[PDB]
Amino acid sequence: GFAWWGRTVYQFRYIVIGVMVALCLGGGVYGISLGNHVTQSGFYDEGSQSVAASLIGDEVYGRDRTSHVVAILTPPDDKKVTDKAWQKKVTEELDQVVKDHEDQIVGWVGWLKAPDTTDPTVSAMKTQDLRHTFISIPLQGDDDDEILKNYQVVEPELQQVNGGDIRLAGLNPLASELTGTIGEDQKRAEVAAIPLVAVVLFFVFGTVIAAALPAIIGGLAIAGALGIMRLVAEFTPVHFFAQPVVTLIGLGIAIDYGLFIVSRFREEIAEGYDTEAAVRRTVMTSGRTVVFSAVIIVASSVPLLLFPQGFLKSITYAIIASVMLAAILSITVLAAALAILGPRVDALGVTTLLKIPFLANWQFSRRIIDWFAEKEVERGFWGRLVNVVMKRPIAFAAPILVVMVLLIIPLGQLSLGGISEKYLPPDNAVRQSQEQFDKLFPGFRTEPLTLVMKREDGEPITDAQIADMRAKALTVSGFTDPDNDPEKMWKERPANDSGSKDPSVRVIQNGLENRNDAAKKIDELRALQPPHGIEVFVGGTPALEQDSIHSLFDKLPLMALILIVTTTVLMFLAFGSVVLPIKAALMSALTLGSTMGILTWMFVDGHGSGLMNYTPQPLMAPMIGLIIAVIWGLSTDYEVFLVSRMVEARERGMSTAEAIRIGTATTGRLITGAALILAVVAGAFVFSDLVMMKYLAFGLLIALLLDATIIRMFLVPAVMKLLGDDCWWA
Incomplete structure (x- = not known):
């Protein structure tokens, strides 16, 4: 089926190149403004009890605007906060700030507003030492x-x-x-990864335009990908991780696909073939493998759509768009460019690149000046290594199996949480500011549980109903009691000017003794029998986080089942065998287990956290769901890349051992280069102030290291030998 497309793309190389390069440039230009139309509210499951409670509370009593931005004021020259001159000056400055922007800021309310007020809540707004204060500045916006x-x-x-x-x-x-931090990571990548991936490509292809064609495609891919996401932003909301996910995964995999296509084309040219025959064979053989790998990534990422999280859905859209566009480019535009170039693809250098490039795109300047600065043995090495591995297959498989099983132990200690200030390095300015806020003014940052009581009949809620609901709430223990008195706990939510005073809805709330135990208390609050005609919801940040965690756990078994089934079916269709998909799924599962174990060992147990200056905190809910799919898809990608040459060798009529040796020897340098490229682009994001990005990048590069050294150098050939001729049992 791919032979027809190869013939067509060779026949219409110029037209396809022009059309798709124009489309990718237009998509990139459209996506330049993706940062303005990107949301950040996809971290919680939608249509759950907690989110319904929060929505009802916002509708009735309005949003809690007192905690939008809190400004801590420290008088200069060690002056007291009660100084009349300082108070007057700061009040005038704050009033001027508020009046200058009547749209961004509702106003400023705090002790400085009324220093003479005898309100204990406000009086607590200033430290006992009278050396600091703070003000709350609610902001407009629905x-x-x-x-x-x-x-x-x-x-x-x-x-x-x-x-x-x-x-x-x-x-x-x-x-x-x-x-x-997303912008910081993108700039860090743009500055550091591209020169290093360019150096890697130079090593793979020596100072030739072939060393630049893959990277270009990479760029185009993400460019076009961004456009698609921008388009997707006009249909459904997207999360601010779509941009990093594109720039990382799509960039790496697009460069990998381009590297594979270019390497196959160069191999065909060296073997001796007309440019038309070369493109046809590299799109039938390597192009088909690239398309199948992209489809495998798509099938391994779609099951994330089951989760209600908008963050996971947005990242799934990003991965799908980037992978599909990278595959489409690598097959159509890269193949057509190779057709146009002909045998001189590996002969000429930076000539056509410097003739007339497209200004202000991908920092092409980066790569071209990198080449300006930088003015067979592998096959034999791989053959001998795999021959040695196959000589003692069990002796190499057993130690690897046992060590990987050992690496899975710390995953048993995995703990999940939600958003917090801990997701920034300890030296971050505002993290320190908020920690100082908490230390100076404890108890002003609370995440209480909320009981939302609603009447289906619309009648106003009687005092007796709230009274006995509060009593039944006191029946449950484990809630903060700073005043040590049951009479005045479970107080009503503060009422803002915004919102409608609906008598049929009443929300009470109270803090929790310990966040970790919240999971139980939530249930104790929900199993609690409500009054006759009142429906009750449990909400609040602990409730939202626990509900998201529970939804993720509930959907994880089905997600894993769909993942395994779809990936196995796709590999069965691609390879055509029945057992290779099974072993590939097992290898992907083992690599995933090892990567998750290492990630829990370092991020949660705090081993090696000092090196990257991030505090050890429990993972967050959607991150594990995302990383499972990402790691599985990527490990399956490299398994398919490694096994495509083996299956082609077997179809060429040679023994299983000979076929596997030939395939691994041929694909060794390409696999090493692709792994290096994706590891480099991930490491560009490792040094990120966002601990979620650290999670994802460390997991990805650990998967790279495992699947590039342990799985393939020693383990996969040994397992193939152990299976023997049964590998092709279909």
């Missing part, structure tokens, strides 16, 4: 994203208050820096 945009707009003028001695913390600053 959506979290719009509030974040307002905060970003008003931040530069807000930081100048008190002569710069102001510490902005809370929710909005944390979200702003969490989003800014």
Whole structure:
């Protein structure tokens, strides 16, 4: 089926190149503005009890705007916060800030607003030492994203208050820096990865245009990918991890596909074949493998769509778009470019690249100046290594199997959590600011559980109903009691001007003694029998996080079942055998287990955390669901890449041992190069202030290391020999 497309693309090489390069450039230009139309509210399962409770609370009593941005004020020259001159100056500055921006900021409320008020809650807003204070500045906006945009707009003028001695913390600053880490990571990649991947390509292909064709495609892929995501942003909301996911996964896999296609074309040319025959054979043999690998990634990433998390759905869209576009490019535009170039693809150097490139795209300047700066043995090595491995297959498989099984032990200690300030390095400015806020003013940052009571009849809720609901709530123990009195716990939520005072809805709330035990208390609050005609929901940040974790756990078995079944069926269709898919699934599962074990060993147990200056905190719910699919898809990708040559060798009429040796020897350098490229682009994101990005990048590069050294150098050939001729049992 691919022979027809090879003939067509050779026949219409110029037209396809022009059409698809124009499409990719247009998509990249469209996606340039993807940062403005990207949301950050996909971290929780939708349509659950907790989210329904939060929505009802927001609708009735309005949003809690007091914790948007909190500004800590420290008087200069060790002056007391009660100084009249300092108070007057800071009040005037804050009033000027508020009046300058009447849209971004609702206002500022705090002790400085009324220093003479005898309100214990407000009086607690200033430290006992009278050396610090803080103010709350609610922001306008009916959506979290719009509030974040307002905060970003008003931040530069807000930081100048008190002569710069102001510490902005809370929710909005944390979200702003969490989003800014994405830009920091993208810039770090743009600066560091491209020169190193270019150097790797130079090593694979020596100072030739073939060394640049893959990277170009990579660029185009992500460019076009971004456009698609921008388009997807007009249909459904997307999360701010779509951009990093594209720039990492799509870039790496697109460069890998381009490397494989170019290597196959060069091999065909060296063997002796017309450019038309060369392109036809590299799209039938290597192009088919690339397409099947992309389809395997798509089938391994779609099961993430089952999870209700919008973050997982957005990353699934990003992965699908990037992979599909990378495969489409590698087959059509890369093949047509190779057809146009002809045998001189490996002869000429940077000539056509410098003739007339497209300014301001992928930093092509980077690669071209990198080549400017940088003005068979592998086959034999691989053959001898695999021959030695096959000479003693069991002796090499057993130690690897046992060590990988051992690496899975720490996964038993995995713990899951939610968003927090711990997702930034300990030296981060606003993380330290919020920690100082908590230390100076403990108890002002709370995440209480909320009981939302609603009447189906619409009648106002009687006092007796709230009274006995509070009593039954006290029946459950394990809630904060700072005042040590049951009479005045489970207080009603503060009522803001925004929202409608619906008498049929009443929300009470109270903090939890320990967050870890929340999972039980939630259930104890839900199993609690509500009044006759009142429906009750349990909400709040602990409730949302626990519900997301529970939904992820509930859907994980089905997700894994679908993942295994789809990947095995796809490999059966591709290879045509029945047992190779089984062994590939087993190898992917083992690699995933080892990677998750190592990730839990370092990130959770805090082993090696000092090197990358991140605090050890439990993982977050959707991250494990995402990393499982990513690792499985990538390990299956490399398994298919390694086994495509073996299956082609067997179809060429040679023994199983000879076929596997030939395949591994031929694909050794290509696999090593692809692994190096993806490891480099992942390491570009490893040194990231976002601990979620650290999670994903470390997991990906650990999968790279395992599947590139242990799985393939020693383990896979041994297992193939042990299976013997039964590998082709179909």
